[PDB]
Amino acid sequence: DKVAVGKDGMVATAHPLASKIGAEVLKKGGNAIDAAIAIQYALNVTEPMMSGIGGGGFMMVYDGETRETSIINSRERAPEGAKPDMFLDEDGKVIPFSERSRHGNAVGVPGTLKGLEAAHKKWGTKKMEDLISPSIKLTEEGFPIDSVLADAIKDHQDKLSKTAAKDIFLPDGEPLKEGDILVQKDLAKTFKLIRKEGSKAFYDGEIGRAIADVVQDFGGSMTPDDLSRYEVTTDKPIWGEYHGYDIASMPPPSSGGVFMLQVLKLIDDFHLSQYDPKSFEKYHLLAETMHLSYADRAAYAGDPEFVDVPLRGLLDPDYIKERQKLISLDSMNRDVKEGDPWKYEEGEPNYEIVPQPEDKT
Amino acid sequence: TTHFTVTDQWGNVVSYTTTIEQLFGTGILVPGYGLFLNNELTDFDAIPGGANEVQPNKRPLSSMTPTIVFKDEKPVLTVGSPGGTTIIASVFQTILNYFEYGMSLQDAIEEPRIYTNSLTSYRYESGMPEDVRRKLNDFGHKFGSNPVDIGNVQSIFIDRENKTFMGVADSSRNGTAVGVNN
């Protein structure tokens, strides 16, 4: 079921049980937003390593009625107790990734549930209870785990062994393997609380309190006041033109939209389909282009509530033409650094350019 | 991270990327509540002073790239992917392969991707020819001996000529596309 066709609706997800649940919402006359909410709950249960109400996301919605594109932004927020140097040791050295990525200081205030409710309020036509219930069933009665979840449990067993996860995912100190039934009674109970009370159980309730308590147990600063402060935002897409199409993508606080658009603007003039898709020329020009866009990303991108990202400058056609002068089949560019997109818009950055060690993942 | 997409009979289109950062996030499961807690704040710079420094109530910089492509103001293609900084690479290469190369949606997705964020960091999917890999490296690149899967693109094409939707799930996970009729 890698490819599908349908007259009246389409679902594509990373888990077949989540795709089936999404499809069923559309089969019962729910809209794409109804189905997407059902899908997030189902992935939370079936692909628990990748996403869920412990995290955050960017949900882009094109509204077929208003013809407006908007994004429900449930990106997590640092708690009030976070400090700029909290990932440095007392000698100012970066704490290794395998240590800091497992510490309570790493946990952002989760937004995913807030985002599902914001989406539901705006576009929802099914009762929230109809959308969460298929996931309660999978959590309650269990499902046989897929190869990617079995591989994930195996690869992350060190991390999972030191937390309350070991009891569900490492039974008898052994990783669940493909086909084993994963039963998540406590997750079913959490979904039942949300089904009964809605998100106040999370952001102003016993789930929020338990989150704050375990974050503090692992050395983090998050309190119930951090959870009660949290709200999602609604973003407009960043737009770019490519090849006769208009592309809507994710603005800051993602780097994704602007740098995906910047790469397409930088390579468009190279007409890459003159070269075989597996040619030296295509791979070389993409590598040279990525080096420039990722260098800009490391210097210029952050939360636009805190810092000014030069979006106009980064996509300016003269900035594009200046950066293209570094991209060539004649050689590899060994002097890769951010450009100066501030040269092409009003104002100045309110930050320094601070080199970071290459240590994430 | 995971990316999914939905289209309905009323012209609504969803492109949704969602994450807890690392696989299982911090690995912390809320005792008695069964949910994993994100490590999203490690997406901040560990060394402050920059645009993406840690601050209280700040959102750490993401690379998530949920995307909708339009033709004459009408949505025609959804794109997104997991994979941290590589997401940008998965999304632009899919779009390049579809619109610039004119591949089928499934070919655009399955075509081996490359990623390099710096002179010291290269990844490539199996299918890059060995001889081309050697030529790239002789020229100054650092594609290693081992290929790795990059990202996981789910996409829907909205076919107004054929009055259909086409859904594609990347082979890099066990994802599926499921179409709906009346």
Ligand SMILES: [Ca+2]
């Ligand atoms: Ca000291």
Ligand SMILES: [Ca+2]
């Ligand atoms: Ca072209």
Ligand SMILES: [Ca+2]
């Ligand atoms: Ca692939």
